[PDB]
Amino acid sequence: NLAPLPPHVPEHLVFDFDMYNPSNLSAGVQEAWAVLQESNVPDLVWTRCNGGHWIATRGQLIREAYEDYRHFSSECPFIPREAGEAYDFIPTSMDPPEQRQFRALANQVVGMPVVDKLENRIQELACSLIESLRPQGQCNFTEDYAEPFPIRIFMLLAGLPEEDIPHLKYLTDQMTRPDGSMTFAEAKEALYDYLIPIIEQRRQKPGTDAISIVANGQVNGRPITSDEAKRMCGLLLVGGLDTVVNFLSFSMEFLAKSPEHRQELIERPERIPAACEELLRRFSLVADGRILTSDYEFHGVQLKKGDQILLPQMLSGLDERENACPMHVDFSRQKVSHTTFGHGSHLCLGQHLARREIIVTLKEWLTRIPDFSIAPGAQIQHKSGIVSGVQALPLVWDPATTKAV
Ligand code: HEM
Numbered sequence: 523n524l525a526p527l528p529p530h531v532p533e534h535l536v537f538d539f540d541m542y543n544p545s546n547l548s549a550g551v552q553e554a555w556a557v558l559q560e561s562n563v564p565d566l567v568w569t570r571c572n573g574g575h576w577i578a579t580r581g582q583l584i585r586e587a588y589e590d591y592r593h594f595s596s597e598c599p600f601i602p603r604e605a606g607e608a609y610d611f612i613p614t615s616m617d618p619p620e621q622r623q624f625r626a627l628a629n630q631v632v633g634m635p636v637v638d639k640l641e642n643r644i645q646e647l648a649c650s651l652i653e654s655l656r657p658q659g660q661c662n663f664t665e666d667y668a669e670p671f672p673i674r675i676f677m678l679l680a681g682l683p684e685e686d687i688p689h690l691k692y693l694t695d696q697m698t699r700p701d702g703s704m705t706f707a708e709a710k711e712a713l714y715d716y717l718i719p720i721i722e723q724r725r726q727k728p729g730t731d732a733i734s735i736v737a738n739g740q741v742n743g744r745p746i747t748s749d750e751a752k753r754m755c756g757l758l759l760v761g762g763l764d765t766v767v768n769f770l771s772f773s774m775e776f777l778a779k780s781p782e783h784r785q786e787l788i789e790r791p792e793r794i795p796a797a798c799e800e801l802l803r804r805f806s807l808v809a810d811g812r813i814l815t816s817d818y819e820f821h822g823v824q825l826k827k828g829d830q831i832l833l834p835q836m837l838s839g840l841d842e843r844e845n846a847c848p849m850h851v852d853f854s855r856q857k858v859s860h861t862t863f864g865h866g867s868h869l870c871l872g873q874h875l876a877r878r879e880i881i882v883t884l885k886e887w888l889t890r891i892p893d894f895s896i897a898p899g900a901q902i903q904h905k906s907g908i909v910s911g912v913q914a915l916p917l918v919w920d921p922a923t924t925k926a927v
Pocket residue numbers: 596612613614625628632757758759761762765766769808810861862863864865867868869870871872873875876877
């Protein structure tokens with residue numbers, strides 16, 4: 523059942539776009555937003571779907587709503603208000619510039635050095651998985667690589683055993699996409715019931731893990747509370763078991779169908795850092811938003827307090843006004859223009875671990891396993907959300923193409 527239209531919204535901006543069922547879904551769950559960038563479609567639109575909300579269709583308009591953060595807040599980013607109200611993650615839901623000490627702590631809970639602490643562990647684990655798969659001609663990559671590679675790095679970084687993985691990979695996904703079982707409030711309170719005997723354990727005995735940096739950070743003249751250690755852990759926990767796992771999945775949902783894009787990285791290994799950056803332009807899996815904090819003037823219209831706007835990453839990523847060659851793919855980037863880390867005050871503070879993980883994966887797959895596709899019969903079903911997903915990724919290859927490394 524679509525919403526009524528508010529009294530302050532005029533009909534010429536109406537598009538009844540649905541966030542969780544995007545209108546051109548069969549193109550890929552980032553390209554399936556591209557229809558919003560047709561010529562007749564303004565820079566700003568409103569929909570009646572999902573309780574009714576603005577959508578910013580272009581990279582400039584998106585970034586101009588990350589730059590007026592003093593009017594556009596992340597205290598509610600989830601366009602389903604029942605999940606936006608429940609949300610409270612750190613740094614992101616705290617107001618800058620007085621956020622500053624929470625994010626400085628984040629940037630020493632995870633930073634370029636931590637990638638140097640796990641890099642050989644990254645390496646040998648991509649090597650040992652991709653040696654285990656090398657001659658096997660098939661796998662379901664969402665489960666035979668993408669979930670157990672980075673999660674067995676993030677768990678070991680945080681100091682948690684492997685045996686909680688399907689219980690935390692259950693909860694993360696229940697927060698990030700609407701399955702139906704748990705609300706965000708439910709899945710969050712269940713996460714926190716599980717993690718606060720662990721954060722308390724990190725107060726009783728600190729250790730060489732990241733949660734023992736989260737729990738003992740000093741901020742605004744005081745300790746970081748459990749109230750706030752649990753909320754900063756929720757972010758990281760969405761970070762290392764959903765954004766980097768689904769991104770991995772999408773990256774091969776492209777190289778699967780792409781014989782030349784694979785060859786380009788075989789002839790020239792020095793495109794592998796630039797191909798991740800274009801993969802982060804292209805397969806920018808996120809559908810973020812923000813709430814209006816005052817009544818405010820935008821794009822020729824007045825917006826009201828308690829209004830919510832979607833600012834989709836892939837509508838910077840694909841936009842002809844930002845990015846040269848945006849539907850076609852090539853890896854020769856010197857520069858690129860997109861929001862798959864946010865903007866201005868917000869900046870992804872974890873994804874440099876995933877950069878070296880994907881780039882290890884890229885450089886150590888295209889050797890052992892150079893030529894490959896998705897299983898025949900298999901159709902890939904894509905899941906839209908505040909972070910987007912897929913159902914399952916069954917890859918195939920001939921054992922006789924494959925190289926011992
Ligand atoms: C490649 C996969 C990932 C992508 C696509 C991604 C995307 C993003 C985006 C778009 C932001 C800003 C959101 C906002 O404006 O509120 C963000 C925030 C953040 N990310 Fe990532 N990220 C990824 C992986 C990770 C990893 C693996 C971690 C965990 C170590 C992580 C932790 C963070 C942190 C701590 C923030 C908060 C930054 C802030 O407050 O400015 N991210 N990331």
